Amino acid sequence: VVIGIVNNTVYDPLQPELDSF
Amino acid sequence: VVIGIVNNTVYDPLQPELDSF
Ligand SMILES: *[C@@H]1O[C@H](CO)[C@@H](O[C@@H]2O[C@H](CO)[C@@H](O)[C@H](O)[C@H]2NC(C)=O)[C@H](O)[C@H]1NC(C)=O
Ligand SMILES: *[C@@H]1O[C@H](CO)[C@@H](O[C@@H]2O[C@H](CO)[C@@H](O)[C@H](O)[C@H]2NC(C)=O)[C@H](O)[C@H]1NC(C)=O
Ligand SMILES: *[C@@H]1O[C@H](CO)[C@@H](O)[C@H](O)[C@H]1NC(C)=O
Ligand SMILES: *[C@@H]1O[C@H](CO)[C@@H](O)[C@H](O)[C@H]1NC(C)=O
């Protein structure tokens, strides 16, 4: 529904921590 | 690079929970 959008990967800080657990 | 700085243990809220898990 948004116009002029782009694609890029946002980083979750919890994701590397929980993956390291 | 900052001036007038001090040292204190800033606290992650994830760290106790993930360490308990
Ligand atoms: C941004 O990401 C979306 C989601 O991956 C892309 O949409 C998909 O594009 C592929 C390739 O054309 C299609 O096979 C999928 O069916 C599309 N999905 C949807 C929900 O439309 C989109 O093309 C990407 N845009 C850019 C500019 O990279
Ligand atoms: C604040 O903390 C930093 C990091 O531990 C201290 O810097 C270290 O101090 C020791 C002791 O003099 C040195 O052996 C290290 O080489 C220092 N490390 C760095 C990266 O500089 C700093 O002294 C502390 N400051 C105060 C006021 O407590
Ligand atoms: C910017 O304008 C061009 C046409 O010159 C168009 O193709 C493009 O989709 C526009 N992009 C945005 C973000 O408005
Ligand atoms: C405050 O002033 C004193 C001199 O009166 C100086 O020695 C000290 O480093 C200064 N501290 C800060 C944080 O500016």
From Swiss-Prot, chains A, B:
Residues of the full protein shown: 1128 to 1148 of 1273
The encoding gene: S
Record protein name field: Spike protein S2'
The organism's taxonomic lineage, starting at the top: Viruses, Riboviria, Orthornavirae, Pisuviricota, Pisoniviricetes
Organism: Severe acute respiratory syndrome coronavirus 2 (2019-nCoV)
Protein's job: Subunit of the fusion protein that is processed upon entry into the host cell. Mediates fusion of the virion and cellular membranes by functioning as a class I viral fusion protein. Contains a viral fusion peptide that is unmasked after S2 cleavage. This cleavage can occur at the cell membrane by host TMPRSS2 or during endocytosis by host CSTL. In either case, this triggers an extensive and irreversible conformational change that leads to fusion of the viral envelope with the cellular cytoplasmic membrane, releasing viral genomic RNA into the host cell cytoplasm.
Top-level taxon in the UniProt lineage: Viruses
Glycosylation positions in this chain: N7
